[PDB]
Amino acid sequence: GKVTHSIHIEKTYGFSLSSVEEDGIRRLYVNSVKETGLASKKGLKAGDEILEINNRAADALNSSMLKDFLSQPSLGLLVRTYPEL
């Protein structure tokens, strides 16, 4: 199954997110990553689920918070991802 990893990044972070609320919880997924970007360098992948940003649940973030956090000089993520095969 999937595994959960913490990612910490310091100085954009070179990724974008998509959101969905179909199952009763808002979820965030990595929409795309830049190959040379900071997030990809720390192992973030397209299709990863973002469980937390800066230790806050995806379901406990609004759009303004997302944008603010992605603009700051450091960023923490908790991600759920399929292991590499």
UniProtKB/Swiss-Prot annotation:
Phenotype for K67E: Strongly reduces affinity for SDC1
Post-translational modification as stated in the protein's UniProt record: Ubiquitinated.
Outcome of mutating K34E: Strongly reduces affinity for SDC1
UniProt subcellular location: Cell junction; Cell membrane
Domain notes: The first PH domain mediates interaction with membranes enriched in phosphoinositides.
Complexes and interactors: Component of the Par polarity complex, composed of at least phosphorylated PRKCZ, PARD3 and TIAM1. Interacts with NTRK2; mediates the activation of RAC1 by BDNF. Interacts with MAPK8IP2 and CD44. Interacts with BAIAP2. Interacts with EPHA8; regulates clathrin-mediated endocytosis of EPHA8. Interacts with PARD3. Interacts (via PDZ domain) with CNTNAP4, SDC1 and SDC3 (via C-terminus).
Disease per record: Neurodevelopmental disorder with language delay and seizures: An autosomal recessive disorder characterized by global developmental delay, intellectual disability, speech delay, and seizures. Additional features may include axial hypotonia, peripheral hypertonia, hypothyroidism, and non-specific dysmorphic features or brain imaging abnormalities.
Function according to Swiss-Prot or TrEMBL: Guanyl-nucleotide exchange factor that activates RHO-like proteins and connects extracellular signals to cytoskeletal activities. Activates RAC1, CDC42, and to a lesser extent RHOA and their downstream signaling to regulate processes like cell adhesion and cell migration.
Protein name, per record: Rho guanine nucleotide exchange factor TIAM1
Span covered, complete protein: 841 to 930 of 1591
